[PDB]
Amino acid sequence: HMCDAFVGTWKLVSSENFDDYMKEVGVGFATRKVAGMAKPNMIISVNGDVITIKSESTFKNTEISFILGQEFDEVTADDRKVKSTITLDGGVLVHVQKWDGKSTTIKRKREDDKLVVECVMKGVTSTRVYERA
């Protein structure tokens, strides 16, 4: 029952500061504009120790599978080649991506009936809110 409250299908309902987050990460103009328009469905599932997160939108469909605490290589939707580790820290799923001497963190937490996503790159934070589909 690792991650029970995260599991399911979720739909984006609000975003704040996401263009600025993407700028800080280094995403180019055209990608920012099309990615910032996306309204993804996030599908989280667990099978034994393996967690899978799928993000599906008109911009890109991505899928990552991982074991908590065990690093993996990831090609992001904006085409960064990153080394990622996802841990559970006090009930928060913490996803760190490292590439080119940089780092960014994406935190997912359950808050009321929502799944709140916080994206941080240096001093720039963005909040995304998901509801059950």
Ligand X SMILES: CC(C)[C@@H]1CC[C@@H](C)C[C@H]1OC(=O)[C@H]1C[C@@H]1C(=O)O
Pull the structure tokens for residue 43: 């599908």
Least distance to ligand X from the beta carbon of 2, Å?
Answer: 20
User: Which residue's Cβ lies closest to ligand X?
Assistant: 77
User: If phi over 0 gives left and psi between -120 and 50 gives alpha, with beta otherwise, what is residue 127?
Assistant: beta
Report CA 13 to chain centroid distance, whole Å: 15
Least distance to ligand X from the beta carbon of 78, Å?
Answer: 4
By rule CB under 6 A, what string of x and - marks binding of each residue 57-96 to ligand X? Answer: --xx---------------xxx------------------
Least distance to ligand X from the beta carbon of 57, Å?
Answer: 6
E-state strands within the chain:
8-16, 41-47, 50-56, 61-66, 72-75, 81-89, 92-99, 102-111, 114-121, 124-132
Positions touching ligand X (CB under 6 A) are: 12, 22, 25, 27, 35, 38, 40, 55, 59-60, 76-78, 106, 117, 119, 128
Residues in binding site for a fatty acid? 128-130
